Every structure is written in structure tokens, then in C-alpha cells.
Design a protein around this ligand. Structure first.
Ligand SMILES: Cc1cc2nc3c(=O)[nH]c(=O)nc-3n(C[C@H](O)[C@H](O)[C@H](O)COP(=O)(O)OP(=O)(O)OC[C@H]3O[C@@H](n4cnc5c(N)ncnc54)[C@H](O)[C@@H]3O)c2cc1C
Lengths: 133, 665, 6
């Protein structure tokens, strides 16, 4: 029904190795050169990656900013309102980004803000100007 | 066993009538099932009786004596059965005590060419049937391809050596009739490379297993894939094995290729990530500067200036978030590359050291078939497999010749008589032979029928060594050329002291090249005396025949020194070297299914020749020329028991022909 | 034949 275990003999492969007088060593050479080709291509990309790893050395350690742990507040200070207007201008609808900029407002409070002051801070105009960029 | 076991021992299905039985008892086999089972019992029981005591003749009376009802009720059925079995050598064959002394006067004259086992077997049979029988042997001895060297206490078979299991072997019967000292062969065979170092059980078991797996593969190629014709020529076993090995080397490479190709996909995936990471560290570098600069603007500051600090703070931590999630990815891919590069697929399919030990396993096969594997028929080389005997193989410890010699007792054998021409006509035959010593001294033999047991190698000779008048028909001569007649040689080494492992029956030697894999590849320790026996097989066998004994004995000692110590191997007192292909009365060792032949050719060889009519318009003549011999028995070729049976077969056919089949009615 | 294999 099928070949023994660890023995590989497909109908196609038999025809290929018997196709002519030296189709045997021809096929075994193409793969021998294919192996050499792929093997040196490895070291080439191993060399390329080795250099890209040296540039990444140091990580981003001298660029990390300490954890700003602050408790969320309900009241919108005049300061915080203005920060918000600017955050809308720069981030559009990314409520998460805006929440991070202000620092003491939750993602939903930002969404609340969007509807409450919608009239007073012309948020319609502010948002359409964000898209223009 | 019992009644049923006797049928098995006689190579017959216990619960079914054979084609031969269908021929002789067409009334029974066409008839009701009840009759058939009675027939089968009578047959099986008679066989049992004969087998249980094979040293005395089993007569019809003795057979009827020991039967029950309703098996002894029909005496004509019992008589027909007994006579059938006796005629075809299933009972009362070989060497046995005769109850009713041989018939007063003979009927019919038969010349048998050659007193090999096949010849002798048939001779005894025909003489038992009361025919005038004279055998013509070119040699100064009986046995032919069964030859035994004897000098002092040294006994070694240059010809047949092994009894291939007793389970269904007619030689089992013969061994009870003749004083054969049958000793079993111990399976284990330690190998030794060219240097003289033993192959470790690690490699040993691996290579052997691979060998057996390569064979199964060729069988798969033949039957399942139907790879049997390549460029009009029939595919050999040799070709098939090369093809399989190549495909296995191709796979080893294919595995490596898609493994390294699996690396470059991961390696190149890492390349793209490292770029994204470097370009992000570049933006983080710049963004930190911007945030720094924004924070240097000391308070108090307006809201836009405050927003800048906050904005750049948000924008930085967000980009620092990304880089860490990318360092996450990098860590996983980095070890995934250590995963794949840790365990590579197979380096090679077989090393040079490996391929050499594999060549020994091929050489063993080249010995078994007595021929280079490039000549064996892929499809049929093993066709006689189903009929192989059960039980462990044995050796004749006192020399196989004991058997032909014992068969030759009480027979008219003309030794030193080389048959030159066989003449057969509607009215009879004349065989023209000469004396081998003075080849100008001529003999004429007249007979009703000629039984030809000439080896296939002889029948192959060109120009012919024996002439057939008229010439053998096209269908016969084609079968002769198609069939393979192989070669295998033995080197006898007689010492005064056992310097080898006495519990080891056989040990191998691995040759340097494929070219010389058969050259002295195996050694036998079997006999009482300190005798070692070296085999020359495959391609090597034919070439070693052109080399003198001294050189052959040289290479033998050289090898033996390498395994046991350069001093522990003394000079051989007596040495013998066979040359079977050179031997004019053999022209080789025994047959093999050559590429382009089949088992059917063996049947063709057995088919008898019937001459044309003397007077034109006269009736269709009797068959005159018959063929027995190792190369005529499809299911047991290239053996002793095969020959033995082929003899018995022809005897039965000839006796049916000239004495008449009294049992068919 | 096959049967002679060691
Ligand atoms: C090296 C070797 C090892 C073997 N080992 C085994 C084994 O282990 N087990 C096994 O079962 N079988 C073995 N065999 C095979 C076995 O020996 C033969 O198959 C068997 O003996 C052949 O019997 P035969 O009667 O058909 O042929 P032969 O024994 O050859 O008989 C034919 C006879 O005809 C004679 N003859 C030839 N030409 C002429 C002529 N012109 N005129 C008159 N006579 C002539 C020959 O001299 C010979 O005596 C081996 C064979 C060889 C060569």
C-alpha cells in the first residue's frame, strides 16, 4: 500500500531520477548548489542582523520617563479644559491619548467632555481642522 | 500435525486437492464434497504412514491394513491413491528397504544424462518402477554440483552445503534414510572492516535494518509503483536499489534545504523587526530631546507651553510602549532561531564507512543468488519465496556427498562418459558419448527415452558442448538464453588449531570498494576439524577464477591475520579453491531469475520434447526427450531438494508414458 | 535464491 517507514519514494520522484542516463546526479547537484546558496544567504542576513543589533545597544534606557501615578479627578479645572481643547486639536478622537495628556481624567470622562462643552469649545470646528492635517 | 502435518511435510494442502490430483482423479474432484474429504484423508494418512517410517517400502497392503471405516471400505480408491503417490515419488522414494524384491524382467530402456542429484533421484525411481536405466556421467564421480572435499579427517563441501530447513523438505526424509550429520547454523555473524576492527553493534544493527528496508522499497517500486521497464529494458534489482538509495539521498537534501529555508524566513522576519526597532529608537532619541527642551522652559508658563510638555510626555511613553512590545517579539524570534539551529535534520544518508558495510549486505545477497544484483529480475528474483521451508537451516557435517553416493547404490552408472550428441526420433533415441580420458573412444546408446539433467550452464554453451538432433525448438532455446545461470565460489582452508571463536559459525569481512564487495566477504566454521571456508561472491567470483590459488590463499590469510592477530594465524596445511564457471560440467554454480526472465521459463525448461513423425502423415509420436534438474523446478530452483524433486517428477512422467498410468481409471 | 541469505 505505502513505502516502509523512513523511506521516501513518490511516483513523481522515481520518474525524475530515471528520466535519463545522468538525471540522477543532475538533480542531486542542483540541490547541492541550492544548499550552498541558501547557506551563505543565511550568514549574510546573520551579518546584517548582527550590525542592526549593535545599533540597538543600550536599549532605550536613557530615554525612559518615570511613572506618573496620579489619582483620577471628577472636576474639570480651567487649566485642564484648555489642555483638552489642544489635545483634541492634536489627537482628534483618540480619547486614550487625550486622557494621558491631561493625566487626571478617565477615557469616558474625555467622551463626556466632548458632548458637554461641544458648544462652548466649538469642538466641531476643532475636529474638522484635525482631519485637514 | 498428525494426518494434516504429513500433507504439509509433503508440500500439499491438507484440505484441498491439487491440480495434479484433479488430473488423476477427475471423477472425485468433480464429484460430491464427501468423496473428496475421504480422498484427502486417504492421501494424507498414506503420506503420514510413509513419513513415520521412511526406511521401509510402504505397500498397498500395509496401507489398507492401517485404515478405518469408511476409509478402508473402498479398496479401489485406496489403491488408486497409493499408486498415484508411489508413481509421483511422494511415498517410497530415496533409499528404503524393499518388501517385494525388484520385478523379474524390465520394461523400456531410459538413458539419463548426468548423475547429479536430479539424475540419481529419477534413476532410482524408474528402476523401482521396473525400467532399464543407465546414467551417463562425464565426471569420475557422482553428485555433480554436490561435491565434498575429503583428505584425512578434513571434510568440506565445495558444492551444496546447507539444508534450508526441514519443514516440508524432502531432504528431511532423505536425512532419515542416510547417515547425515545435520548441525544447525547459529544466526549471529560479526562483521569486520578492512582494517580488521569489528563493526560496533550501533552501526551493525543500523546498516542491516537499512538494508532490509531498502529491499522492501524495491518490492514497493516493483509492485505498487510498477517500475519494471526502463528504456525498453527490464529493470534489475541493482538498478532498483540505486534508484531507491538516490531518492533517499535526495530526501536527506530536501530535508536540509527546507530547514535552512525555514531559518531564512525567521532570520529575515527578524531583520524587518530590527529595522522597525532601530527607526523607533531614532524617533525616541529625537522625542526625548524635544521633551527635554520643552521642560527647560521653567514655570510659570502659558497653557500651550504646558501642553507641549504634556503632549511630548504622552507621545514618548506611547512610543516607548511600542519598542517594548517589539523587544517582546524580538526575544521570542531570537530563541526560535536557537530552536531550529539546535536540532538540524540528517547530515548525510550514509557515510563512506556506512555504504561499505551496506555493500557487504548486498554481497551477502549476491552470494545467495550467485550473481551481481544488476542481473536479477526486479519483479521475479524472489518468486520462489512462498515455497520456502520452515525450520532452521542446517549443514551436513560429514559432507553432503554422502547423499549422492548413497543414492548411486545399485545403479548402472557409466562414469567418465561425456555425452556429445542426443538423437531423438519417433521410433526412439540414440545418445552418442565419448570416454573423457581418451576422447576418440566412442559409445552409442539406444533408448526409448532420454532424461536430460545437464546443468543450465552446459545447455547454454556456445558453441554447444552437447548437440541435439534435431535441434531443440525455438521456445526451448529462448528459455535457455533468457534464464540466468550464476556463479559462486568457495575457498577451503585447513588448519591444525582453532584460532577463531568456536561458538561463532560465521563471520564477515567488509571489502574496501563496491567493486570488490564479494571478494572473500564471509567465513564458515561448521565442521569438526579446524576448517575455515571463504566465499567469493557477486562480480568478484568471476574475476577471482583467473587468479591462482596461492594468491587467493594469500588474500585469505591477510584478512584472517587482520581479525585474529598477525601471529595467531598459522600456515594452512591443505587448501582447495572451486572454479565453477570454469568447470566444463557445470559452467557456473546454479540458476537465478535474470532480468527479462520469470518463473515461467523454469516451466518451459521442464516441458518435454516430442519428435516429428518418421513417415510423413503418420500419427503424433510419443515424447522422447525429457528434462530434469535444478533449473526445471519453478518453486524450488537452485537447490538440492529442488533437483531431487525435479528428478522424482520426470520419473513419474516417464513411467506414466511408457509403463502406462494404471491409476487414472 | 532468497533462501541462501545469511
Ligand atoms: C558452490 C555451490 C553451493 C551450493 N550450495 C547449496 C546449498 O547450500 N543448498 C542447496 O540446496 N543447494 C546448493 N547448491 C545447488 C545444488 O548443488 C544444485 O542445485 C544441485 O546439486 C544440482 O543438481 P542437478 O542434478 O540439477 O545438476 P548437477 O548436480 O550439475 O548434475 C548434472 C550432472 O551432469 C554431468 N554432466 C555435465 N555435462 C555432461 C555431459 N556432456 N555428459 C555427461 N554428463 C554431464 C555433471 O558432471 C553433473 O554430474 C549449490 C551449488 C553450488 C555451485
Amino acid at each position: 500500500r505505502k513505502p516502509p517507514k523512513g523511506m521516501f519514494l513518490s511516483q513523481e520522484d522515481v520518474e525524475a531520477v530515471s528520466a535519463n542516463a545522468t538525471a540522477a546526479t543532475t538533480v542531486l547537484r542542483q540541490l547541492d548548489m541550492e544548499l550552498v546558496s541558501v547557506k551563505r544567504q543565511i550568514q549574510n542576513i546573520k551579518q546584517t542582523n548582527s550590525a542592526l543589533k549593535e545599533k540597538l545597544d543600550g536599549g532605550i534606557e536613557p530615554y525612559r520617563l518615570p511613572e506618573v501615578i496620579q489619582k483620577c479627578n471628577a472636576r474639570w479645572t480651567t487649566e485642564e479644559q484648555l489642555l483638552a481643547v489642544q489635545a483634541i486639536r492634536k489627537y482628534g478622537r483618540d480619547f486614550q491619548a487625550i486622557s494621558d495628556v491631561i493625566g487626571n481624567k478617565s477615557v469616558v470622562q474625555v467622551k463626556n467632555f466632548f458632548v458637554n462643552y461641544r458648544r462652548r469649545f466649538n469642538i466641531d470646528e476643532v475636529l474638522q481642522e484635525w482631519e485637514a492635517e | 500435525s498428525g494426518v494434516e502435518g504429513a500433507a504439509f511435510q509433503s508440500r500439499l494442502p491438507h484440505d484441498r486437492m491439487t491440480s495434479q490430483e484433479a488430473a488423476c482423479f477427475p471423477d472425485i474432484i468433480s464429484g460430491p464434497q464427501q468423496t473428496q474429504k475421504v480422498f484427502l484423508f486417504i492421501r494424507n494418512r498414506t503420506l503420514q504412514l510413509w513419513l513415520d517410517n521412511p526406511k521401509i517400502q510402504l505397500t498397498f497392503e500395509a496401507t489398507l491394513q492401517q485404515l478405518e471405516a469408511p476409509y478402508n471400505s473402498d479398496t479401489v480408491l485406496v489403491h488408486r491413491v497409493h499408486s498415484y503417490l508411489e508413481r509421483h515419488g511422494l511415498i517410497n522414494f530415496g533409499i528404503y528397504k524393499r518388501i517385494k524384491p525388484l520385478p523379474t524382467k524390465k520394461t523400456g530402456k531410459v538413458i539419463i544424462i548426468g548423475s547429479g542429484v536430479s539424475g540419481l533421484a529419477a534413476a532410482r525411481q524408474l528402476q523401482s518402477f521396473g525400467m532399464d536405466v543407465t546414467l551417463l556421467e562425464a565426471r569420475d564421480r557422482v553428485g555433480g554440483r554436490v561435491a565434498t572435499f575429503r583428505k584425512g579427517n578434513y571434510v568440506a563441501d565445495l558444492g551444496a552445503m546447507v539444508v534450508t530447513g526441514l519443514g516440508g523438505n524432502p531432504m528431511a526424509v532423505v536425512s532419515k534414510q542416510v547417515n547425515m550429520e545435520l548441525a544447525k547454523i547459529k544466526q549471529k555473524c560479526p562483521l569486520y572492516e578492512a582494517n580488521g576492527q569489528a563493526v560496533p553493534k550501533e552501526k551493525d544493527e543500523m546498516v542491516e535494518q537499512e538494508f532490509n528496508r531498502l529491499l522492501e522499497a524495491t518490492s514497493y517500486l516493483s509492485h505498487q509503483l510498477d517500475f519494471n521497464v526502463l528504456n525498453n529494458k527490464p529493470v534489475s534489482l541493482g538498478q532498483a536499489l540505486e534508484v531507491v538509495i538516490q531518492l533517499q539521498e535526495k530526501h536527506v537534501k530536501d530535508e536540509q534545504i527546507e530547514h535552512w529555508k525555514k531559518i531564512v524566513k525567521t532570520q529575515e522576519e527578524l531583520k524587518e523587526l530590527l529595522n522597525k526597532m532601530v527607526n523607533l529608537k531614532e524617533k525616541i532619541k529625537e522625542l526625548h530631546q524635544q521633551y527635554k527642551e520643552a521642560s527647560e522652559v521653567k514655570p510659570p508658563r502659558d497653557i500651550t507651553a504646558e501642553f507641549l510638555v504634556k503632549s511630548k510626555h504622552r507621545d514618548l511613553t506611547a512610543l516607548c510602549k511600542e519598542y517594548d512590545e517589539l523587544a517582546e517579539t524580538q526575544g521570542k524570534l531570537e530563541e526560535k532561531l536557537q530552536e531550529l539551529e539546535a536540532n538540524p535534520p540528517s547530515d548525510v544518508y550514509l557515510s563512506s564507512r556506512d555504504r561499505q558495510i551496506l555493500d557487504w549486505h548486498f554481497a551477502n545477497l549476491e552470494f545467495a543468488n550467485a550473481t551481481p544484483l544488476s542481473t536479477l529480475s526486479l519483479k521475479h528474483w524472489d518468486q520462489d519465496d512462498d515455497f520456502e521451508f520452515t525450520g532452521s537451516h542446517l549443514t551436513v557435517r560429514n559432507g553432503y556427498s554422502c547423499v549422492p553416493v548413497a543414492l548411486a547404490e545399485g545403479l548402472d552408472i557409466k562414469l567418465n562418459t561425456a555425452v556429445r550428441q542426443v538423437r531423438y526420433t519417433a521410433s526412439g533415441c540414440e545418445v552418442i558419448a565419448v570416454n573423457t580420458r581418451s576422447t576418440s573412444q566412442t559409445f552409442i546408446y539406444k533408448c526409448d527415452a532420454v532424461l536430460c539433467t545437464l546443468p543450465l550452464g552446459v545447455l547454454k554453451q556456445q558453441p554447444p558442448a552437447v548437440q541435439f538432433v534435431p535441434p531443440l525448438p525455438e521456445w526451448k532455446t529462448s528459455a535457455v538464453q533468457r534464464m540466468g545461470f550464476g556463479n559462486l565460489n568457495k575457498v577451503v582452508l585447513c588448519f591444525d588449531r582453532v584460532f577463531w571463536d568456536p561458538s561463532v559459525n560465521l563471520f564477515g569481512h567488509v571489502g574496501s570498494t563496491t567493486a570488490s564487495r564479494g571478494e572473500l566477504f564471509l567465513f564458515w566454521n561448521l565442521y569438526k576439524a579446524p576448517i575455515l571456508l571463504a566465499l567469493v561472491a557477486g562480480e568478484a567470483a568471476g574475476i577471482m577464477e583467473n587468479i591462482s590459488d596461492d594468491v587467493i590463499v594469500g588474500r585469505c590469510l591477510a584478512i584472517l591475520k587482520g581479525i585474529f592477530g598477525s601471529s595467531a594465524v598459522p600456515q594452512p596445511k591443505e587448501t582447495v579453491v572451486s572454479r565453477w564457471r570454469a568447470d566444463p560440467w557445470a559452467r557456473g554454480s546454479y540458476s537465478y531469475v535474470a532480468a527479462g526472465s520469470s518463473g515461467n521459463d523454469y516451466d518451459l525448461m521442464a516441458q518435454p520434447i516430442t519428435p516429428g513423425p518418421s513417415i510423413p502423415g503418420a500419427p503424433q509420436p510419443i515424447p522422447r526427450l525429457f528434462f530434469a534438474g535444478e533449473h526445471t523446478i519453478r518453486n524450488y530452483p537452485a537447490t538440492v531438494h529442488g533437483a531431487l524433486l525435479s528428478g522424482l517428477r520426470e520419473a513419474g512422467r516417464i513411467a506414466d508414458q511408457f509403463l502406462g498410468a494404471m491409476y487414472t481409471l | 535464491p532468497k533462501s541462501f541469505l545469511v
